[PDB]
């Protein structure tokens, strides 16, 4: 009932080098769970697995760009 | 149908929307996706209802 | 204020067909004018002219699956 | 290109608790450096310096949210 989240289904089926941006959204009254939304080169957006290995490395790639 | 916007909503006040992202239908997602960002920072998926997104696009393009 | 307009100038020579995503940004502290960021199939991003009707057609092509 | 850097300056100090969203934009034709966009409760957006631990504390603050 308190999970009106954009991120319903997540993924790990993406190459880190294809991510142009990552948004980390705090849990809130509407979606009381953290959210990781990543944008691809094609403008396509996807949700990443809260605690899967991939996100950690996506963040490293981004910062060293 | 490997979308982001699996469940959409119309419960939103057009005036609180700071940005709207319109995503074209593709191989990973059968239909178009409307992703609005509110002032507080929150993101949501809008219902593909012409009168509603038209109103929204108007307030944004006329700001 | 920490932010400024993202758009420097707009592009008029582009095919609606090549746009994968369009971001419409309301005016505010960051920028006194609305912004239309179109992402192309290759990943390139451009800004569209507000006066120009070109975008009303891109929104059409986009909104129809 | 059509786009310039969104961040014209940065805010070297803010309490991790004010942030509701952190967008990490990788360097590209739009900007030669990464950019850290933090959205505050009031809806204010500030840019952060690319200091590893400092925002890596804002990111965990958000993930453990």
Return the closest-CA partner of residue A34 out of D23, D61, D26.
D61
**Residues preceding gaps in chain B (C to N > 2.5 Å):** none
Which residues from chain B sit within 8 angstroms of residue D39, using beta carbons?
A: 40-41
Residues forming beta bridges with residue D22, ordered by sequence position: A24, D38
Q: Please check whether residue A6 touches D, CB under 8 A.
A: no
Contacts of C53 (CB under 8 A, 6+ apart): none
CA distance D9 to A33: 31
Nearest to B33 by CA among C65, D20, C32: C65
CB contact under 8 A, A6 and B4: yes
Taking Cα atoms as reference points, which of A44, C51, C10 lies closest to residue D3?
A: C10
D29-50 burial code (b ≥16 CB/10 A, e <16): ebbeebbbbbbbeeebbbbbee
Q: Please answer yes or no on whether C20 and B20 come within 8 Å at the CB atom.
A: no
Q: What is the resolution of this structure in A?
A: 2.0
**Closest residue in C to A41 (Cα–Cα):** C43
From chain B, the residues in CB contact with A35 under 8 A are 43
Rounded to whole angstroms, the Cα distance separating A25 from A37 reads 8
Closest CA to D46 of C51, A53, C3: C3
Q: What's the full length of chain C, in residues?
A: 65
**Cα B20 from Cα B39, distance rounded (Å):** 12
The verdict on whether residue C59 carries a ligand-binding annotation is yes
In DSSP terms, B20 is beta-bridged to B36, C24
**Domains of chain D as residue ranges with CATH:** 1-65 (2.40.50.40)
Q: Are C37 and C47 in contact (CB under 8 A)?
A: yes
**Residue B41, SS3 per DSSP:** coil
Q: Does A23 touch chain B (CB under 8 A)?
A: yes
What are B25's strand-pairing partners? Answer: none
Experimental method: X-ray
């Amino acid at each position: 009932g308190d999970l009106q989240c954009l991120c319903v289904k997540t993924t790990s089926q993406v190459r880190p080098r294809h991510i142009t941006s990552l948004e980390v959204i705090k849990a809130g009254p509407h979606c009381a769970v953290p959210q990781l939304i990543a944008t691809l080169k094609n403008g396509r957006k996807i949700c990443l697995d809260l605690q899967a290995p991939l996100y950690k490395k996506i963040i490293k790639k981004l910062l060293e760009s």
